[PDB]
Structure 1
Amino acid sequence: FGVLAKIVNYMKTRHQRGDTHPLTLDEILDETQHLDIGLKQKQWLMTEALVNNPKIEVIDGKYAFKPKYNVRDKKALLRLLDQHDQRGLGGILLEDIEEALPNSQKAVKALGDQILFVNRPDKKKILFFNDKSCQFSVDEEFQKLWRSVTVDSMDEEKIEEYLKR
């Protein structure tokens, strides 16, 4: 078992170094000096361990990096977001940084395109969401707003009536 977690750590380091190209199990075991980890461990790793992981990318007869076998498009699904009856996906910034590239380079363009940052899940965490249109009045908003939240205080079918009369 522990050698498979060393392989997943090496493959995670390969994406952090800049690469998602597929390799054979041999090329992985050679670089990590696990080539002699034992033929029984190599066979189990090949025919059960890289088979029991549903997140492994199988491509070119080989195995590649690593948490996503699909939808590694490294940009937001704007097209789904266009559809206000089905638009839905904000996630965690950590998955998006994990996916491909640092946020900042993409974000400079995105701060004036689609992205909104919310400090959610905690101060150390950020959630990204897509944005919107204009407001419904130019006022100090918050002063007026705090007075106009309003009338949760009963006899309200009668306060609609009282206004109507």
Structure 2
Amino acid sequence: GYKFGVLAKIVNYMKTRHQRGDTHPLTLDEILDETQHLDIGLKQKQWLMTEALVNNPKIEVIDGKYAFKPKYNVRDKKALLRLLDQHDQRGLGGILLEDIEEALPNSQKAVKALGDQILFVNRPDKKKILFFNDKSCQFSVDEEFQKLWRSVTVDSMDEEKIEEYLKRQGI
């Protein structure tokens, strides 16, 4: 095909820039010169600028020149914790640890610094999902109690038999 893999290459170049650490936004024509996109037609570049650059969430537009959003990815562990709290409040859910890793250097040290406040759940793809803990309410469950729970099955109990058990026990 034509004019798709080139866009993919530009986006990959942006990730490479971010592994470089150049926060300063760059001109699209200069990016093309670096990526050997001069051969491509100008009209495809204009269509990219008008539509695809804005659609891409990672990309951002500043002073008429396009670059990634330094706010989107996590930069400090405190902001990661605050984002987790906000996500818990608004029901967003956890965020993928691979994305957080490529976002933030030493993200594993950030999680170690979190400690108990941060809850991580394993996934079959090994991706880690992070959920903020609830400060307001703290409870402890013991394994023997959970087992004593586990055995009993209300599904065995028939609903009429339920209301009957309350009425029998005189309350």
Q: Which has the higher helix share?
A: 2
**TM-score where L is the length of structure 1:** 0.62
Q: Would the aligned equivalents of 2:96 and 2:129 in 1 still touch at CA under 8 Å?
A: yes
Q: Would the aligned equivalents of 1:118 and 1:127 in 2 still touch at CA under 8 Å?
A: yes
Shift of the alpha carbon at 1:9? 1.2
Distance change in 2, residues 1:75/1:3 (3 Å):
farther
Shift of the alpha carbon at 1:83? 8.2
Q: Would the aligned equivalents of 2:61 and 2:67 in 1 still touch at CA under 8 Å?
A: yes
Q: Which stretch of structure 1 is more off in the superposition, 53-62 or 43-52? A: 43-52
- Matched pairs, number: 165
Distance change in 2, residues 1:74/1:55 (3 Å):
farther
Distance 1:97 1:85 in 2: 17
Structure 1's unaligned 5+ residue stretches are none
Residue by residue over 1:79-136, the C-alpha shift from the partner in whole angstroms, topping out at 9 and shown as x without a partner, is 6876899442223424642662046355345433521001135445545454567765
Secondary structure at the aligned position of 1:57 is classed as: strand
Q: Would the aligned equivalents of 2:73 and 2:103 in 1 still touch at CA under 8 Å?
A: no
Q: Which stretch of structure 1 is more off in the superposition, 6-15 or 134-143? A: 134-143
Q: Which stretch of structure 1 is more off in the superposition, 83-92 or 58-67? A: 83-92
Shift of the alpha carbon at 1:58? 0.6
Secondary structure at the aligned position of 2:119 is classed as: strand
State the Cα RMSD in Å.
4.4
> Which residue does the alignment assign to 1:40?
43
Q: Would the aligned equivalents of 1:12 and 1:66 in 2 still touch at CA under 8 Å?
A: no
Q: Would the aligned equivalents of 2:95 and 2:130 in 1 still touch at CA under 8 Å?
A: yes
> Which residue does the alignment assign to 1:29?
32
Distance change in 2, residues 1:47/1:130 (3 Å):
same
Q: Percent identity?
A: 100
Q: Would the aligned equivalents of 2:73 and 2:100 in 1 still touch at CA under 8 Å?
A: no
Secondary structure at the aligned position of 1:42 is classed as: helix
Q: Which stretch of structure 1 is more off in the superposition, 107-116 or 57-66? A: 107-116
Shift of the alpha carbon at 1:41? 4.4
Q: Would the aligned equivalents of 1:57 and 1:66 in 2 still touch at CA under 8 Å?
A: yes
